[PDB]
Design a protein around this ligand. Sequence first.
Ligand SMILES: Nc1nc2c(ncn2[C@@H]2O[C@H](COP(=O)(O)OP(=O)(O)O)[C@@H](O)[C@H]2O)c(=O)[nH]1
Length: 303
Amino acid sequence: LATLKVIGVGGGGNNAVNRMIDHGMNNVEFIAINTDGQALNLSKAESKIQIGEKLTRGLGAGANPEIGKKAAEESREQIEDAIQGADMVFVTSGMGGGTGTGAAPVVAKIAKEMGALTVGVVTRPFSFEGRKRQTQAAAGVEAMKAAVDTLIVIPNDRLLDIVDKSTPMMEAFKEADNVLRQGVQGISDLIAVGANLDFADVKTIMSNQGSALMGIGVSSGENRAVEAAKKAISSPLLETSIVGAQGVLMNITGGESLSLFEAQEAADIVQDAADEDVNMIFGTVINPELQDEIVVTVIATGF
Ligand SMILES: Nc1nc2c(ncn2[C@@H]2O[C@H](COP(=O)(O)OP(=O)(O)O)[C@@H](O)[C@H]2O)c(=O)[nH]1
């Protein structure tokens, strides 16, 4: 099999990883990296790494990406042990901050150099979070694009239609914790439990590609495979049409009622909606706790 590890860098990344653990995510190994020691105490993650004990004194990075970066460099040795043995690494974070913006490109570089498959699933701050935060976000993404094989970036501003009414500012990122889960889980489930899936294909589809898009669709009808896939390619999470992708990774997740016929019939929707020369690979994941629900996750990389 393959050894998959999910690393959360920063408070936001660590909070998303907490949600992943809480949601019942499995097949994967969680790691929590923060400069803030006291917030790292709140991590459900099995392995915890506090970085920049000297630089920060466990106080935090003060939303300074320069501090977060040196913190990771200072503890580069400790990061390497965590990543050791990993076939795939996920770097989960939120950009615009200090620990996430600065240190996550370091963890991503350390992982990719060690021969792991590095995908980073990160977010972009809300428009209201600041002007500095958006500024350090963009620079953080660019430092992430270079450091990783494939990068999925989800602007929080697109999650603004699905945010729960009367929610406070402190709970504003609950949907970010979900969408970060959907991206990490959509891939993790497909490798570890997927049916038509072999790792070298993922490696090919996702290595040194750069930017990617994520679409999730859910349906429970007679033609749920078609419906969920059509929802997936028409998802509000993709910035643009999937047609520009020269690779597509598709996860069809369903219960025991999910057939070979259903899987391909769903995959036909995703392949018309993309260029005719795409390398598309899909697989089936079985969660027996699903009776009539089916979830389709597509990752469109290549542009
Ligand atoms: N997914 C998620 N993102 C968050 C959360 N809190 C903050 N963020 C995002 O992460 C950025 C702040 O980074 P944060 O982890 O809080 O501080 P850092 O340690 O300096 O990286 C903000 O721009 C937010 O958009 C959270 O609970 N979950």
